[PDB]
Amino acid sequence: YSYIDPTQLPYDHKWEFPRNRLSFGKTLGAGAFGKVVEATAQGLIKSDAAMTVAVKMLKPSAHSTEREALMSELKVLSYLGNHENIVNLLGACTHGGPTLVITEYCCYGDLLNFLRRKRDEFVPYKVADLYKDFLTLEHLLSFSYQVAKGMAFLASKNCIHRDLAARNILLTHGNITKICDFGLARDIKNDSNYVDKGNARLPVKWMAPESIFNSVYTFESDVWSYGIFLWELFSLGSSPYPGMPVDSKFYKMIKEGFRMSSPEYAPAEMYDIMKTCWDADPDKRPTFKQIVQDIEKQISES
Ligand SMILES: Cc1ccc(C(=O)Nc2cc(-n3ccnc3)cc(C(F)(F)F)c2)cc1C#Cc1cnc(NC2CC2)nc1
Ligand SMILES: [Cl-]
Numbered sequence: 001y002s003y004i005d006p007t008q009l010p011y012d013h014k015w016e017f018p019r020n021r022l023s024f025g026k027t028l029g030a031g032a033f034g035k036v037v038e039a040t041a042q043g044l045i046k047s048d049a050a051m052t053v054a055v056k057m058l059k060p061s062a063h064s065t066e067r068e069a070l071m072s073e074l075k076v077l078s079y080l081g082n083h084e085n086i087v088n089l090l091g092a093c094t095h096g097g098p099t100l101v102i103t104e105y106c107c108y109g110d111l112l113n114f115l116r117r118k119r120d121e122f123v124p125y126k127v128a129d130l131y132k133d134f135l136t137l138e139h140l141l142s143f144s145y146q147v148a149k150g151m152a153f154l155a156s157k158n159c160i161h162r163d164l165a166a167r168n169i170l171l172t173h174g175n176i177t178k179i180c181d182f183g184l185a186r187d188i189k190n191d192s193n194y195v196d197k198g199n200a201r202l203p204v205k206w207m208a209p210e211s212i213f214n215s216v217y218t219f220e221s222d223v224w225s226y227g228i229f230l231w232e233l234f235s236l237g238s239s240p241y242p243g244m245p246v247d248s249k250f251y252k253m254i255k256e257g258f259r260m261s262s263p264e265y266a267p268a269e270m271y272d273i274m275k276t277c278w279d280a281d282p283d284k285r286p287t288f289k290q291i292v293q294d295i296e297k298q299i300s301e302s
Contacts (some may be wrong), residue, residue: 009072022040024037031185054102106172115135116237123135141299145292146176152291152292163181211224259275
């Protein structure tokens with residue numbers, strides 16, 4: 001559970017929304033047991049106008065474990081409340097059928113795919129041509145700032161993410177990021193970034209050593225994952241530890257202090273943050289609040 005028990009968190013019934021007022025559309029993503037579909041919600045706004053949303057729900061393949069996980073997810077999201085760097089919960093459907101979790105629809109998709117389709121036209125300094133929506137260094141700095149602020153908020157609410165990575169960051173217009181957790185709606189079975197370890201399938205390359213070797217998730221283990229996320233960002237969407245399978249050698253090398261080199265586009269001061277995030281001692285890692293103050297100053301001087 002880490003610090004808080006989600007089952008004990010309350011569900012504010014102000015979120016409850018009539019499920020008959022949702023019309024399901026295309027599936028945006030799906031795992032073994034859950035999925036996220038695009039939908040239109042009628043009467044979500046005071047005007048009769050229907051607005052587009054995203055809905056997370058379980059599949060008929062799901063078991064009692066996944067049913068509780070989705071309800072626990074809803075409790076956590078309601079407990080967190082609205083925050084600008086987090087995907088916006090809009091409503092939920094809890095009675096009259098299965099649990100539905102309704103969030104905003106983010107038009108530009110996940111950050112990892114965004115980085116990969118923008119990689120070839122990346123601009124390190126200035127854009128002449130503005131209409132092309134070229135990815136810039138200024139954008140990457142802002143991305144890392146917004147995600148750090150979002151994680152500082154989660155930390156202040158005693159919430160551990162456990163799967164922070166570019167694939168779990170959504171993008172809206174103006175290059176605003178929203179931290180997400182697609183969880184059961186991601187096909188982790190066939191995603192090479194998740195690795196068999198014991199009876200589970202885990203994002204090992206994003207995980208801190210203490211998490212790998214004794215399944216502990218802390219404030220500080222999320223900070224490790226953030227450092228890996230920065231490497232993704234400033235490599236423009238590359239997979240971490242390239243050409244290096246997850247095996248006994250990988251775990252040994254990480255435990256003995258091997259760390260990635262700086263990605264091709266990382267400012268030296270952003271790489272400095274990565275190295276501290278990857279400190280073997282979790283107490284020497286920075287906090288998300290400290291990371292926010294660090295990046296803020298970098299942007300000032302940019
Ligand atoms: C519908 C939905 C429901 C829930 C979430 C979600 O993130 N839940 C979440 C859960 C936990 N949690 C805690 C404990 N157990 C789980 C923690 C976090 C947080 F905040 F900590 F990160 C979040 C996301 C969506 C979505 C979407 C969507 C996809 N695609 C596009 N658009 C692209 C172009 C097509 N837009 C929107
Ligand atoms: Cl199914």
